[PDB]
Amino acid sequence: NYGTVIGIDLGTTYSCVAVMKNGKTEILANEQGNRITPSYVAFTDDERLIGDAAKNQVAANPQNTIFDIKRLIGLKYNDRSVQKDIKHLPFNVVNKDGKPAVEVSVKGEKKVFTPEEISGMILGKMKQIAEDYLGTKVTHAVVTVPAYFNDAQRQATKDAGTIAGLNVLRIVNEPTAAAIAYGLDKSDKEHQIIVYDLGGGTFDVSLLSIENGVFEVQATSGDTHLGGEDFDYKIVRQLIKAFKKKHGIDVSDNNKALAKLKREAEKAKRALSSQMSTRIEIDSFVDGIDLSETLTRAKFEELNLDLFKKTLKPVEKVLQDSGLEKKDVDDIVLVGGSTRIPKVQQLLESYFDGKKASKGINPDEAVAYGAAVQAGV
């Protein structure tokens, strides 16, 4: 009666869908060939764009394009974090019955959608990726949320599923899913797992216990404004300054210039994960002027050291709170693509006196993978 039930990682910046097929779990690529899908929704006169299509047309439609809705879901309009988060948003957020809701213009009339509905639009796209891949309709899913999410936030996630046409049979904690993806649940004596989850815009760490095969979340800590994008931004800002000093032109307001820069900065960061220095170049960048600049891994790490270091304070807090000593940690699980940054790995390992983190599943896909594993009832 459950059909083929799917696993979905519904992230702040990216979402990912997986399914257990013939006892193997497969991560499923979207219509654009991508295994991970931006958590974006865009409203145009003619279209409701979701995912890749939505994030591509962000530039010239910066206020009908919804992102980071996960920051609002299940929360109250008066909540401190909603107030703070609202400022840094380029789209309109209104109070509807005490809950935050987004207001867009199509057209040119005002339309309002809850965080449940925007989430449901994202979930619907993930479902349809699974339906294209399977031969049929799916009606049930396992969906993941951060471990600190409260009851309101979990119900709102299940409600978003209903709106996508999904019965969410279970809401699973994200750090647990990743632990399951690593088969850390085959204990076999009580184990203490630390999950270190550095996403695109948020940072989570969780101390889990596992005994007999029952997970239990011991502590959580983290930073809602610390992620991969922050590191990229430090490169971008370094580039903007370099170009200004050299040619007198400030590109901070030039959107086309910015779009090109953010993308090259992301390519640079990726290179510095394997090389010690790189060149960043853009032909006809502005006003007939070519951009050409160097970045070393040392400079990149220096730019980001306070940020990289702030990730350890939550690790300690999670040990203090639980009462554990470092030596009592059996497994360190890395979630989120930014965990591939050598300095990030080095700091954590060094913090655990040299012990190796479990990395072997793509860290962007581990959550969805564990979700799909559960969904295999």
Binding site: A259, K260, I280
Partner: protein
């Protein structure tokens, strides 16, 4: 195919398929198609998808000499943006399209038989520099030295030529004086960045380690080497713990070079 840009290239493809000779109105649309998508070519994912779907087309428009320079520049510029810091694009092209390097060098020399035109020259140099250069591809020393000479007005272009020469020497033997003379002049250029300084340095270091007295190192370079020695030793000689490992080693290697190689 599809592919989130199948649209724009479906368009471009039949506009060119609608008439053997593109009209002013046809190339103006092609241009505008190029203006819109340029920004996505820089994307790690988009750049790869674009090359794997449209490369045949891109290279045709870049290399068609009957077309106007501005149009060729636009297609060429999509390629360069897809290539930079994009290993999977580099591997793709160099493997599925092994003759492209040679075609590119061909256009380079035909451009230099003119006009400027310097812009497309630079795009081609950029491409040749992103693609591997092996013993196989051995690229005229005369054309390159001609382009180099013709353009003292364009240091950015010279810099790109000298970068390519560093790669050709590497592929040949193993891993003439006029070139060692160009490197020595340019290496002292104050506007050159540290990564180009290293590349030019290493080329000279290697040449001098290999041919010894048969390559002449000039006085000015030796003066620059001395100034660079004190500045960079003074860099090794502070704190704190941090360090740029790669920078430190290069400094040591250049300091030692004096008592030995130079």
């Amino acid at each position: 195919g599809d592919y989130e840009f199948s649209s724009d290239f479906k368009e471009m493809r039949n506009i060119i398929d609608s008439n053997p000779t593109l009209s002013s109105q046809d190339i103006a649309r092609l241009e505008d198609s190029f203006d819109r998508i340029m920004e996505f070519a820089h994307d790690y994912k988009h750049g790869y998808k674009i090359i794997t779907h449209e490369f045949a087309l891109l290279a045709n428009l870049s290399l068609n000499e009957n077309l106007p320079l501005t149009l060729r520049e636009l297609s060429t510029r999509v390629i360069t943006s897809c290539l930079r810091n994009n290993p999977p694009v580099v591997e793709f092209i160099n493997e599925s399209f092994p003759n492209f390097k040679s075609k590119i060098m061909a256009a380079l020399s035909n451009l230099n038989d003119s006009r400027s035109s310097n812009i497309l020259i630079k795009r081609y140099l950029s491409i040749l520099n992103e693609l591997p250069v092996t013993s196989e591809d051995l690229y005229s020393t005369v054309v390159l030295q001609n382009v180099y000479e013709r353009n003292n007005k364009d240091k950015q272009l010279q810099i790109k030529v000298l970068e390519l020469i560093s790669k050709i020497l590497k592929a040949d033997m193993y891993e003439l004086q006029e070139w060692a003379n160009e490197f020595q002049e340019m290496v002292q250029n104050k506007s050159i960045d540290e990564l180009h300084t290293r590349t030019f340095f290493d080329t000279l270091y290697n040449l001098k380690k290999i041919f010894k007295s048969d390559i002449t190192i000039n006085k000015g370079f030796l003066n620059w080497l001395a100034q660079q020695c004190k500045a960079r030793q003074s860099n090794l000689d502070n704190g704190l713990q941090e360090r740029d490992t790669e920078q430190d080693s290069f400094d040591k290697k250049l300091i030692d070079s004096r008592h030995l190689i130079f």
